[PDB]
Design an enzyme around this catalytic site. Structure first.
Site, short mmCIF file in Angstrom:
data_model
loop_
_atom_site.label_atom_id
_atom_site.label_comp_id
_atom_site.label_asym_id
_atom_site.label_seq_id
_atom_site.Cartn_x
_atom_site.Cartn_y
_atom_site.Cartn_z
N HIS A 12 0.75 -1.27 0.00
CA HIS A 12 0.00 0.00 0.00
C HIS A 12 0.77 1.30 0.00
O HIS A 12 0.15 2.37 -0.05
CB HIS A 12 -1.03 0.00 1.14
N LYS A 41 -5.30 -9.36 -8.32
CA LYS A 41 -6.09 -8.70 -7.28
C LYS A 41 -6.96 -7.65 -7.98
O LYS A 41 -6.44 -6.82 -8.72
CB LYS A 41 -5.19 -8.07 -6.23
N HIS A 119 -3.14 -2.56 8.06
CA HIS A 119 -4.21 -2.94 7.13
C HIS A 119 -4.80 -1.68 6.50
O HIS A 119 -5.07 -0.70 7.19
CB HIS A 119 -5.25 -3.79 7.91
N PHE A 120 -4.98 -1.72 5.18
CA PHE A 120 -5.66 -0.66 4.47
C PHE A 120 -7.15 -1.02 4.46
O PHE A 120 -7.58 -2.01 3.83
CB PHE A 120 -5.10 -0.48 3.04
N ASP A 121 -7.92 -0.24 5.19
CA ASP A 121 -9.33 -0.61 5.41
C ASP A 121 -10.31 -0.05 4.38
O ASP A 121 -11.23 -0.74 3.95
CB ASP A 121 -9.78 -0.19 6.82
#
Length: 128
Positions: A12, A41, A119-121
């Site tokens: 990210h 992805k 984490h990229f939420d």
């Protein structure tokens, strides 16, 4: 063994390249960063900001994670990000992407000491 913090940077972050993502940025990045292993992805976001600015999000606005059961953090500022979106005809290993630079707030989950994004939420598009 890759830490969650480093995995977040791999998946990210893009602090070092020039600010301007060209049309083939995502094609290259999604391979480089190991996001097309056995699958393409569908959507991935890279953040074009200094690492410290993204880490600082971890003491900015507290928000509920999308899973409804965790503490996440929303960036006070809209940040430069690039969305990589898989083209409709693409099938692994021919993973071609549309590169879409934009300005959005990021929402991240943070962990560890020091307390950094793991984490990229989600991202947030402010109305104009």
């Amino acid at each position: 063994k890759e830490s969650r913090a480093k995995k977040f940077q791999r998946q990210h972050m893009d602090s070092d390249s020039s600010p301007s993502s060209s049309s083939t940025y995502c094609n290259q990045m999604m391979l480089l960063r190991n996001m097309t292993q056995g699958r393409c992805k569908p959507v991935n976001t890279f953040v074009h900001e200094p690492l410290v600015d993204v880490q600082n999000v971890c003491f900015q606005e507290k928000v509920t994670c999308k899973n409804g059961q965790g503490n996440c953090y929303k960036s006070n500022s809209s940040m430069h990000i690039t969305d990589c979106r898989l083209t409709n005809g693409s099938r692994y290993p021919n993973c071609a992407y549309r590169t879409s630079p934009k300005e959005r707030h990021i929402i991240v989950a943070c962990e560890g000491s020091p307390y950094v994004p793991v984490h990229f939420d989600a991202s947030v598009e402010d109305s104009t």
